[PDB]
C-alpha cells in the first residue's frame, strides 16, 4: 500500500 524506507541516523 505504502512502500517506505525508514533510515535511522545517530549522532557522534
Amino acid at each position, epitope marked *: *500500500k*505504502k*512502500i*517506505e*524506507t*525508514h*533510515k*535511522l*541516523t*545517530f*549522532r557522534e
Partner: nanobody
Amino acid sequence: QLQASGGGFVQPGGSLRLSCAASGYTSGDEIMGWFRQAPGKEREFVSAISWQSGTSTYYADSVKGRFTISRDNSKNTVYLQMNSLRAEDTATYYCAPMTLAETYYEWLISGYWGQGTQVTVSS
C-alpha cells in the same frame, strides 16, 4: 479523459481554483496529482489526493497552507484551490494520475539510548 481548467492571469495575493474532470473512475480509488512547469524550468510536484482507504493529501512544502486539493466524488472531479498566489507560482499546471512509488524517512536519534528488552520468537 482528463481535462485541466480554471487557469488565469491574476494579481499576487489572488486566488484561482483549478479543476481536473475525469470521465470514468480509473482504478477504483487511485491518486490524482497536480504538477506545474514554468518557462525554462523543470516540472515540480504541487499536490496529490488519494481516496482509497479514506483521503490523504500531499503538498509541496512551498504551497502548504496556501493551496488545498479536494475531490467531488459525484462529479468525478479534483480541485486545487490556490490562495495567496505569488509571482513564483506562475506556470502551466497539469493534472495526472500518479503513483506513490517510495517514501524515504530520515529519523534522527541523539544520545545514549535506554535499556532494551529482548524478544525471542522460538517454537
